[PDB]
């Protein structure tokens, strides 16, 4: 099927330039579509930044004046997108897009990509294991957790078990606080499936290229 | 310049009843080839945008039949027929005339339940936290309703408000609860000071707190 993959930097320092990738499988870019660039800021406000279609015709926000730029690898199926002197206020989620021209999208979207416009440095997440005190009602649930502390820029991407445990599974917004973020994640299952079975959270931080495993041990 | 304007949230929507989302524009989003150029957008927590409806009234490719679009050229509406726990999320309208082809601000579905009280548990700090200096006691209020809670932290029996941050979830998709997060972060010195922690959750579902509690 078609596919759309927005790939870049997470951080980037204000006044510099934002570059950002999408990558197309399963359809030619070469074609008469409006492959789009839109992002999201934090509040969710949504807006359209841009397009390419049939590899040279560009069209731009207006609002964006003359620091953005759309460009085209035909030979890698891959449209850019090029913002330059960015601020704080570039801060969003960037999403790619395949509009066409009575504006039906169908289900071709990226799955986003965040990017931070801030001078503060980028920091790995410190993961700690939540694992209850003593023993609570037994012959039910348990609930377990892992502590994701002072990382920079967001995002994390936390699983339990490789992905193979996802429901009862609750995974909060992180809040900053001194240029740090600091997440939790909880998951529920019965009294017999932990310890019995082994419970791993695996925390993945894209900005610092860092990966952590951690194992949930009884007290 | 089109200005597109919508409701930020819907009064509660319980399962199985139906609802219409107003979108209205600055401008008629009439072409001249007799088509209305309106996007209708359902958005997820931390999923990208889905189409639903373009050109007013037409629905996208696999999307559910239940929902279905209508309206002039200044006002359009989104019904969602039978709603379901899965439907909630927040819903954007953007018009496709001219550019910049902007978005309305979003309105959020927010779906009604039964009252549900909050599962509680509270976590120490753990050995690893512990030798970086640090100590923070984690507590979780899962899956209740209504939304709104509070939360209590006691040391040795006194209330500890600072150093307390909290986090809530958005509506489940699957239950329609909320969950939050509640985290007391002290220094390994303090912590060692004392013996008893406890976390207090009171909820519209019960007159008394359910506490939650460990020795260290
Ligand atoms: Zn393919
Ligand atoms: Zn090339
Ligand atoms: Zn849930
Ligand atoms: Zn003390």
């Known amino acids: 099927e078609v596919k759309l993959s927005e790939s870049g930097p997470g951080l980037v320092k204000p006044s510099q330039s934002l570059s950002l990738t999408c990558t197309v499988t399963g359809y030619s870019i070469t074609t008469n579509y409006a492959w789009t660039w839109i992002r999201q800021f934090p509040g969710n406000k949504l807006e359209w930044m841009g397009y390419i279609r049939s590899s040279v015709i560009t069209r731009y926000n207006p609002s964006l004046k003359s620091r953005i730029s759309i460009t085209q690898d035909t030979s890698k199926n891959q449209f850019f997108l090029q913002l330059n002197s960015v601020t704080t206020e570039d801060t969003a989620t960037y999403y790619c897009a395949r509009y066409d021209y009575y504006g039906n999208t169908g289900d071709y979207w990226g799955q986003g990509t965040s990017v931070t416009v801030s001078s503060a440095k980028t920091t790995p997440p410190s993961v700690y294991p939540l694992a209850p005190g003593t023993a609570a009602l037994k012959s039910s649930m348990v609930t377990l957790g892992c502590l994701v502390k002072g990382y920079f820029p967001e995002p994390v991407t936390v699983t339990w078990n490789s992905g193979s445990l996802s429901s009862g599974v609750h995974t909060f917004p992180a809040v900053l606080q001194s240029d740090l973020y600091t997440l939790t994640s909880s998951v529920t299952v019965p009294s017999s499936t932990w310890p019995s079975q082994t419970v791993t959270c695996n925390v993945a931080h894209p900005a610092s290229s860092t990966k952590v495993d951690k194992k949930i041990v009884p007290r | 310049d089109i200005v597109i304007t919508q409701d930020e949230l819907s009064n509660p929507v319980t399962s199985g009843e139906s609802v219409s989302i107003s979108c209205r524009s600055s401008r008629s989003l009439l072409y001249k080839d007799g088509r209305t150029y309106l996007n209708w957008f359902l958005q997820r927590p931390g999923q990208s945008p889905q189409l639903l409806i373009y050109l007013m009234s037409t629905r996208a490719s696999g999307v559910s039949d239940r929902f279905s679009g209508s309206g002039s050229g200044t006002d359009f509406t989104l019904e969602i027929s039978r709603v379901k726990a899965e439907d909630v999320g927040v819903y954007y309208c953007?018009?496709?005339?001219?550019?910049?082809?902007?978005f309305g601000s979003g309105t959020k579905l927010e779906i009604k339940r039964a009252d549900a009280a909050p599962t509680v548990s509270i976590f120490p700090p753990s050995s690893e936290q512990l030798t970086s200096g640090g100590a923070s006691v984690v507590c979780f209020l899962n899956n209740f309703y209504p939304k709104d809670i509070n939360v209590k932290w006691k040391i040795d029996g006194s209330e500890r408000q600072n150093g307390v941050l909290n986090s809530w979830t958005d509506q489940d998709s699957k239950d329609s609860t909320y969950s939050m997060s509640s985290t007391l972060t002290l220094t390994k010195d303090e912590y060692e000071r004392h013996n008893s922690y406890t976390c207090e959750a009171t909820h519209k579902t019960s007159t008394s707190p359910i506490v939650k509690s460990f020795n260290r």
């Open positions: 953007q018009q496709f005339v001219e550019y910049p082809f902007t």
